[PDB]
């Protein structure tokens, strides 16, 4: 199913056709969009599906998730080889994250590093993530 509509369905945890509060931001971030703090402050109390689809359609018209995510990863590309350290990402996910268990983190890291190279191609990873 299309990604935005599925994200709405997945983060409408009450099943009331409304996404509200943290879930709202989560829904947005689940599609690979990092809204600015101004955009976060401007978000309404809650959104029904028309509101959410309009917000995401207008956002994606000026914001490409793939390129922004690869751009965020490249800030930690020390070797400048299209790679980031797997254990660094693991540690920061565990230190700053609030939603994911440790097993989920570990699973993600094995995904991004299937050969256990200790590196993550992140470009290939973001691509084979955003399908």
């Amino acid at each position: 199913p299309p990604r935005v509509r599925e994200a709405f369905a997945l983060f409408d945890t009450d099943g009331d056709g409304e996404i509200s509060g943290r879930d709202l931001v989560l829904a947005i971030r689940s599609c690979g969009v990092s809204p600015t703090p101004d955009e976060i402050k401007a978000l309404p109390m809650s959104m029904a599906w028309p509101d959410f689809e309009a917000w995401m359609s207008k956002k994606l018209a000026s914001y490409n998730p793939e390129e922004e995510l690869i751009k965020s990863f490249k800030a930690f590309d020390r070797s400048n080889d299209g790679t980031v350290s797997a254990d660094e990402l693991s540690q920061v996910m565990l230190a700053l994250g609030e939603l994911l268990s440790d097993e989920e983190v570990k699973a993600m890291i094995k995904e991004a590093d299937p050969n256990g190279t200790g590196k993550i191609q992140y470009a290939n990873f973001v691509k084979m993530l955003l399908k």
Partner: protein, 136 residues
């Protein structure tokens, strides 16, 4: 019980066969609850035009003996964060018209008119009512 089944099938039949669409209605009148997944699965081997023997086979494989109150209740309770056992009519409508095999607005409005009194639905009692009258 069987003669009325035969007669109801044949009143809808053309050249001895009925659409699987009409077979859904006939099965429901018989007291069975087939899904659209059942319809597609049966069409995969038998097509979408059934003579009486094939309709009997479709009926025989749509009894869903796995149905039970607890699994339906847990499916609904997934959307009940407080887990106190209630869902609003807004919640019931959105859930039933969004997930699984979504109801049309007409289907849900008929359901709500007959079964929803207050704005707070005890979905356990609702699921129990939904399981009633199934032909066993």
């Amino acid at each position: 019980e069987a003669d009325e089944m035969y007669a109801r099938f044949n009143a809808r039949a053309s050249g001895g066969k009925v659409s699987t669409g009409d077979a859904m209605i006939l099965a429901r009148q018989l007291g069975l609850a087939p899904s659209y997944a059942d319809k597609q699965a049966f069409e995969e081997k038998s097509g979408d035009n059934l003579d009486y023997a094939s309709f009997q086979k479709f009926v025989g494989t749509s009894t869903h003996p796995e149905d039970n109150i607890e699994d339906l209740v847990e499916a609904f309770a997934y959307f009940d964060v407080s887990k106190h056992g209630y869902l609003t009519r807004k919640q019931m409508g959105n859930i039933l018209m969004t997930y699984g095999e979504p109801l049309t607005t007409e289907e849900f409005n008929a359901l709500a008119a007959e079964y929803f009194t207050s704005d707070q639905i005890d979905y356990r009692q609702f699921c129990k009512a939904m399981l009633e009258a199934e032909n066993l």
